[PDB]
Symmetry: C6
Subunit: 90 residues, 6 copies
């Protein structure tokens, strides 16, 4: 039940750049890569809280240079019930 980091962008170029900067900046695993329409894509990572916080800061900053960031967030310990609604693979 590790920390969860999320970066949502409008556009796929921003999502790919966020994903690359997140995995490169800290020891985190890509666990979600979700499209919900209206061009919105959410990149999700998991790891220890410090690594996830560093990853989301790097990802949002990198995606904002090339594209459009909608939201970014860290959940240090998602409730066990939340795992049902999280993606099962990136």
């Amino acid at each position: 039940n590790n920390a969860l980091g999320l970066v949502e962008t409008k556009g796929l170029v921003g999502a790919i750049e966020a994903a690359d900067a997140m995995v490169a900046s800290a020891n985190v695993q890509l666990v979600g890569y979700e499209k919900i329409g209206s061009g919105l894509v959410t990149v999700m990572v998991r790891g220890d809280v410090g690594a996830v916080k560093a990853a989301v800061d790097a990802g949002s900053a990198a995606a904002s240079v090339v594209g459009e960031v909608k939201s970014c967030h860290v959940i240090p310990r998602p409730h066990s019930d939340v795992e049902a609604i999280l993606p099962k693979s990136a």
Copy 2:
């Protein structure tokens, strides 16, 4: 035929944060997690009315900090006919 709580967000980060805050704030079960396009996602919970009201208040407040809330509502006792149109799992 328990109470139904709904939080609809524009963006997946807001939906995940609403879902986490709803299940953490009261004894409710996640029963819906629906995408309808235009980036709209609806998170649905069920439980006793007091727990559902507390969950929707927590979820809408949490989602509004990180994303965009479209609507939130509680139906204390959905009509039996309505169960046909509700999701069958989250």
Copy 3:
């Protein structure tokens, strides 16, 4: 070939609230619950014209309190050819 009532909302919370208020306010059956993108959802009911008119008035009013109503309408007797394009279940 009974009367048809339609409530179209932008957002799922408005659609669920319309559906609940429609079935609770009159003796009508839920026959359609359709998503067409751009967050638009249409709730459809059937029954005798008086019941359908009461249902659509209740549904549009209820959905407007919690969400956004796009259109609402009653067709007292849809032409037989129209049944081809109507949903086959809610």
Copy 4:
């Protein structure tokens, strides 16, 4: 290779009302009912040119009262090559 009539609406309520008014106003057959996203729905009819012109005039007028009409048009004789891109059923 009969005449083709088209009414495109933003919203399903407008599309259903166009379809009902088209089939009721003239001897035309419903041959298309297509969703392309952004809430756009196109209703298509076929028949003799006079019937199709009457149907499209009735459909666009009826849909404009309850919803939003995007476009309406009549093609008196679609080119044989065009039949490939037309729907195969309503």
Copy 5:
């Protein structure tokens, strides 16, 4: 590796009218009819460059009268690598 002509419209009525005017105005074959969301539809034709240029001019003009044209273009000789991303049928 013949010339490629493209007409992209917002709305299906504009796409059908473009397709009909393109095939009627010159000796071209319909090779693509693609939906990408946000109501965008791209009609594609192939043939000799003069026929394709005449087709795209006719199609964009016809679609602009009834609907909304987003873009139109002619590629006289698409690179062999591009054939991978072109539709395999209209």
Copy 6:
């Protein structure tokens, strides 16, 4: 683990023109052609960094003449973890 070039357009005509100009301007392979809704399409190429940079410059310039460019970017060496979220074919 070669360089990755991305051109995202609003509209398919811009995407096809970007893809053609990218493959024609440098020795790059088309590796992605992705639709995410809201009319957004991302064209992806791979190759040596100099070829990818030349391809993305040519593609964005060409797509901007005929359509709308949302973003363009080059990643000289995507992190190994990123390959999970990249398309598996164009």
